C-alpha cells in the first residue's frame, strides 16, 4: 500500500546537445592498453623487481642526497675568491 505519490510525473533525463559525427575511430586494442596502463596501481604487487626499484628510489637515493646536503651545508663560498684563497670554509 506504500507507493510514491501519483501526483509525480517523471520523464527521461536527456542532457541534449548536437550529436557530432564520430571523428575518432576507436581501436579496442589501444583502449585496452591505455586502461591497463592507467589503472596499474590496482594490480601492483611487491616482487623482487618492484621492491628493488622501491628501495633504490624511495630509500637509497634520498639517503645519498641527504648525506650530500647535510655534509656540504655552509661548506663553499665562491664570490670573488682569488688565487691561493681557500674556496672552502671548513
Amino acid at each position: 500500500e506504500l507507493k510514491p505519490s501519483s501526483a509525480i510525473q517523471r520523464g527521461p533525463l536527456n542532457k541534449g546537445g548536437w550529436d557530432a559525427p564520430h571523428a575518432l575511430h576507436n581501436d579496442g586494442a589501444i583502449d585496452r592498453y591505455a586502461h591497463w596502463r592507467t589503472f596499474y596501481q590496482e594490480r601492483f604487487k611487491y616482487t623482487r623487481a618492484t621492491g628493488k626499484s622501491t628501495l633504490i628510489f624511495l630509500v637509497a637515493f634520498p639517503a645519498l642526497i641527504g648525506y650530500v646536503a647535510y655534509q656540504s651545508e655552509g661548506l663553499f663560498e665562491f664570490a670573488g675568491k682569488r688565487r691561493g684563497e681557500s674556496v672552502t670554509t671548513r
Binding site: W36, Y40, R43, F44, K45, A49, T50
Partner: peptide, 26 residues
C-alpha cells in the same frame, strides 16, 4: 616476454594478453 622488464610485469597483469614484443622497426 623476451626482456627482463617485460617479464617483471608478468605478476602485474591479470586478464591482459601476455604479448611477446617485437620492435616495430624490425
Amino acid at each position: 616476454i623476451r626482456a627482463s622488464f617485460d617479464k617483471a610485469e608478468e605478476p602485474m597483469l591479470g586478464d591482459y594478453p601476455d604479448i611477446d614484443p617485437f620492435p616495430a622497426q624490425l
